[PDB]
Amino acid sequence: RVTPGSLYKNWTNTTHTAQLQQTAVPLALPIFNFDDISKTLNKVVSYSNKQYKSLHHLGSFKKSQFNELFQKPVCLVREDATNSFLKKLVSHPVKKFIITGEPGVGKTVLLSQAHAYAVDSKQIIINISYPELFLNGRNDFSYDDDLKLFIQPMYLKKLIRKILKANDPALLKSIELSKDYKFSNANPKNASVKPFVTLNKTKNTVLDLLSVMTHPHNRGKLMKAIIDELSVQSKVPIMFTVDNFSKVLTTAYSAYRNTENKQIYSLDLQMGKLMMDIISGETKFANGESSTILAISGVDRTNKTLPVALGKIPVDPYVTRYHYEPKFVELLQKGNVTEFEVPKLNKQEVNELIDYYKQSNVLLDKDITGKKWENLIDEKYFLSGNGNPRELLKSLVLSHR
Amino acid sequence: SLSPLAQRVVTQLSVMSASRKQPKLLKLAREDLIKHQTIEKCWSIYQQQQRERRNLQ
Amino acid sequence: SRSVWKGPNIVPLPIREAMTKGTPIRTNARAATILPQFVGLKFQIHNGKEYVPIEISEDMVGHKLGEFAPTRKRFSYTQT
Amino acid sequence: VVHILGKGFKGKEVIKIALASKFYGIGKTTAEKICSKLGFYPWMRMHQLSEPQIMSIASELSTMTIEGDARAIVKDNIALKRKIGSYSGMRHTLHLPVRGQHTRNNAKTARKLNKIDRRG
Amino acid sequence: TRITLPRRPAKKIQLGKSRPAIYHQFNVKMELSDGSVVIRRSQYPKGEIRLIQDQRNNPLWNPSRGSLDRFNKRYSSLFSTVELSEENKKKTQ
RNA sequence: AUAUAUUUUAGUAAUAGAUAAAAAUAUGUACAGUAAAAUUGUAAGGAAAACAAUAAUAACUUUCUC
RNA sequence: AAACUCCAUAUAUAUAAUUUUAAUUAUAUAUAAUUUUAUAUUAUUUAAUAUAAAGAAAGGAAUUAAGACAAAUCAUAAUGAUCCUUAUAAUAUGGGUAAUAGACGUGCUAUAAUAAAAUGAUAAUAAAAUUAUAUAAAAUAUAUUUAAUUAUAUUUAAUUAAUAAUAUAAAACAUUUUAAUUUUUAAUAUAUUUUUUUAUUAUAAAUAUGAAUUAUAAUCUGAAAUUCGAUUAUAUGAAA
C-alpha cells in the first residue's frame, strides 16, 4: 500500500534520502580553496563542483547532519578549527592526524574540508566513512589462503568503486604499475573466452587495475595489489581517511564467526588489518604529502584505549580488554598520531552562521521579527553550550518549543 | 476414504495375505520329476530306517 | 541434598535385614533418595494415612520414596 | 521458496533465526553454531543461499538430533515417568499442572496440553 | 459404532489351485547372553541379533551356576558392601 | 555417480482348504463329513466370552525292521 | 470544627578545626502568613472580580465527635457463663492448609514501530533506608575464546556506620536492529541523496511479538525441597 512519491522511511532516513533539498533558495556563496583562505577566512563557503562530486562519492556528507536545509552541503572556514588543521597538515613531517572533540563539534565537516583540499591539490583519496559496515557482520566474508586474513568481498567492491569514482581519472591513470597482476575474470562478456585478466608492468595503469572485476575470492587479492601500487607510487599524494574510527578502536572483535563458534578479531580481517597497517609506520607511502586523517564519532562507544594512545592518561594495566585494548594503542604509538582537538565556535562565528541561516531562510519568525540581533545571538550561544554547532543548529531549527 | 490407522491395518493384512506376493508354480521336466521322486523316496526310506533303529534301541 | 555435590539424600533404614529375608521396610521418610543398593526390596512408604506397598524397580533409582505414595485422593465433582 | 530439510522458508528470512523458528531441536545458540560451521556471515538471508550451501545445512541438520527425534525423547521421558507410579507421571496422565502449581484457578494451559503424547 | 474394514468380493481359489502360504523368511543368528549362537528362521530382516536377558543368564534356568546408570554417573566422585553397612541400622522400622 | 527418455512395478484388503456346526444364497445336482452336552485346564476371563483336550484296535493292506 | 502538632518551605543564630564533609550539608533554637496593601468595576460601611507592589510564601500527614449498625474480633490478649479433665489437655513422625467441574473478586504479564530489544568505564542524573540472630567489596574459577554482561562457586577487604558495604539508580538522551511490509534484501550497472539514489533481474492472519506449558542438566537455602521452595542453562514456544 505504498507509492513511489510517498515517504515510507523513518524521520532521519527520510531527511537524508527524500530530496527536500529540492525546494531551497539558490545561494551565490564563495568557493572553498586553501590557496585563497585569506579572502574567505571566517565566512560560509559552498564547495566547488568537482569537490562536491568527489566528496559525495567518498561519503563525506552524512545523514544526521542538516545538509537538507540548503541547496547543497555547506561549511564555513574557521581560523581556530579548520584553517589551523590544514596548516598543520601542510607543514608537519609525519602528516598523521586523529580529529577529536565533543559530539556535534564538527569532525566530519573537518574531514570533508580536508578531502576538498586534497581534491584541489591533485591528490587521491581513499575514504572509509563508517567502518561499522566492514566491522559489524552484515555482508559476506571468506578466509583467504594466500593472505592470512578474512576478506569481505561485498564491502571491498564498494570501496574500490568509491575510490574509482571519487578521484579524477587523469591523476589516477598517471601511475604505471610496479608489478604484473593476474586476476580471475568476471565480466558478462568474455567469460568463456578470457578466463583470466592480466595487467602488465609499464603498459597497464592503476585506473585499469581499479576497473578489474573478479570473483569474490580474488577481490581481496585485487585490493591488496591496489594498496601496494599506491604505496609504491611517488607521483601523486594519497590521502587515507577513516571517520567513526572510535567504533574501530572499541569494536576490537567483529561479529563474524570462524569455523569454530567464536568471534573473529578485527586485525584478523582484511580491511581492519589493512587500515591498521596504513595508520602505523608499515605500509609507508613513497610520496610526501600522503596523509592519514582519522575521525572520532560521539555516536560510538568511549573507553580507555584512545586516551591511553594519546598523551592523556597513564597506562593502567589492570583495566579489561573490553575497556582497554593495548595492541591498538601500541599500533597508534608506532605511527606517530598527533591528535587534533576541534574547538567549539566563537561568538563571532556563531553570529556569522546565524546570519547565513537567515539569508538562506531557515530562521523562524519568532527569532527574526521583534527581537534584537545581538541578544538572539547570545541566546543561541547559551543554548548551544557556548558554540556546539550541531546543538546550535538544533536550537535554531528543530526546537519548536 | 481411509484413516492412517486403517491404512496401517491394511498393510498388516497384506503382509499375511497371498495377494500378488507369490511366484509361479514349480514346473518340472519329466526326467527332473523322476529325479525328485527318487530323492524323496530314498529320503523317506532313510527316515523310516532311522525310526526303526531308534525304536529298536 | 539435591545438588549433585553433597548428594545423595540418605536416611537410616532396616535394609540389610530386608535383603537377608523378605521383610518389607515401613518407611515414614518420604524424602529418602532411592539407591542402587535397594532395588528389588519391598518398601511400605507412608501416605499420611496408610502405608503404601511398593517394589522398587531399576527405573526408580534417582527418585524419592514419597514420589510413589500419592497423598491426596483423585479429585472429582458431585454433579448435582 | 528456499526449501531445506522439508521445512519451507520465505526469502529475506535471516538464516539462523529462520532455523531457530522452524526446527524443533534448535534455538538461537545452536543455529549460530551451525552457521559458523558452514561459514555464513551473520544476518545472511535465506534467499542468498546457493544449492551446495543448502545441502551442507541439510547435512548439518541431519547430524544434529532434531525435529521428530528430539520430540520423541521428550515423549519417551514422560512415558517412563508414567510407567513408575510417580506423581509427575500421574499429573501428566490426568492433564493437570506438573510443576508444583496451584489449580484452584488458572490451570487451563496444563489441561489443554499436559498429555502423555505431548508435542504437536 | 463398531470400527471395521468393509470386505470386497472374495477371490475364488479353485479346488486344486490352492497354494500353501510360504512366507519370506531369513536365517537369523541369535547370540544368547553368553557366546552360544543359534540359527532360527525369522520373518523380520535382521541376519544377526545378540540378546542381553536370556535363559542362559537367568537364575531360574541355571541355579547351580537408564535411571540407575544416570545415578551412577552423577554420584561417581563419592563412589556411593561398606556403604550399606554404614547406612543400615535395623532398630527403627 | 548423476541427467533425460521409454517402460515396469506400488491401487498394498483377508478364503490357499472340496473349507465341514461363527456368521452369510432357504429351490437343483455332484462329492465329502459329523453334531451336542458335560468334564479337565488355560492372559485379562469371573456361573456366563475364546482355544485345547476327553470310548475301543481284534483282524486286513502297504511300508520299514529284528 | 478551627488553632496549637508533625513533615516540607524561607530567613536568622549556634555547632562541625570543611579527612565521619554532603557546608550545594545536618540539627537544635527562634522568626515567618488562616498573608498584606492600594486603584478601579459591579452590587449593597463592606464583598466578589480585575489590575498593581510587597513577599520564599504553595502543599501533605496526624487528628475522623455524639449516637447508631446487637457491624468486625472470645484465633493478639484477657474475663463472665457454659462444656472437656487418660482428654476437647501434652509430645513426636508423616500428611494437609498448595486438592480442582463451573463461578467470583483483586493483581501481574502480555497482544510490536507516537514501541520493543543490543550497546553506552575519564562510568548522565536521585532519594529514602538497612547492615553483632550481620551487609559482603574487590579479585579469581566455571557457564562462555577473547572481555563485558548475567548467574553461581572460591574468599572475606572494609563498617557494626554521616566514616565501609547493600548500590556505577532507571527511565532519559545517542547509535544499531526490528516481522507483519517486493515499505526489504543482493547481482549487475548507475551518480553532485554514496551509513544513500535510480534502472533491470531474482527475492511467494501469531513474528526476529508473547512467554504459558513441559523435558533434561546444573546451582541456592536448609538436617530435609516427593507431595511443596528459589535461581541459571539448553530445548519446549498455549492463549492472546
Ligand SMILES: Nc1nc2c(ncn2[C@@H]2O[C@H](COP(=O)(O)OP(=O)(O)O)[C@@H](O)[C@H]2O)c(=O)[nH]1
Ligand atoms: N565545523 C563546522 N561544523 C558544522 C558546520 N555546519 C554544521 N556543522 C555541524 O557539524 C556536525 C558534525 O559533527 P561530528 O563531530 O561529526 O559529530 P559526531 O558524528 O557525533 O562526532 C554536524 O552535526 C553539523 O550540524 C560548519 O560550518 N562548520
Ligand SMILES: [Mg+2]
Ligand atoms: Mg561522526
Ligand SMILES: [Mg+2]
Ligand atoms: Mg524452534
Ligand SMILES: [Mg+2]
Ligand atoms: Mg565539603
Ligand SMILES: [Mg+2]
Ligand atoms: Mg483539627
Ligand SMILES: [Mg+2]
Ligand atoms: Mg462517632
Ligand SMILES: [Mg+2]
Ligand atoms: Mg457486635
Ligand SMILES: [Mg+2]
Ligand atoms: Mg453480631
Ligand SMILES: [Mg+2]
Ligand atoms: Mg470466654
Ligand SMILES: [Mg+2]
Ligand atoms: Mg471461634
Ligand SMILES: [Mg+2]
Ligand atoms: Mg486465649
Ligand SMILES: [Mg+2]
Ligand atoms: Mg490432645
Ligand SMILES: [Mg+2]
Ligand atoms: Mg490459602
Ligand SMILES: [Mg+2]
Ligand atoms: Mg513490543
Ligand SMILES: [Mg+2]
Ligand atoms: Mg549510567
Ligand SMILES: [Mg+2]
Ligand atoms: Mg563483586
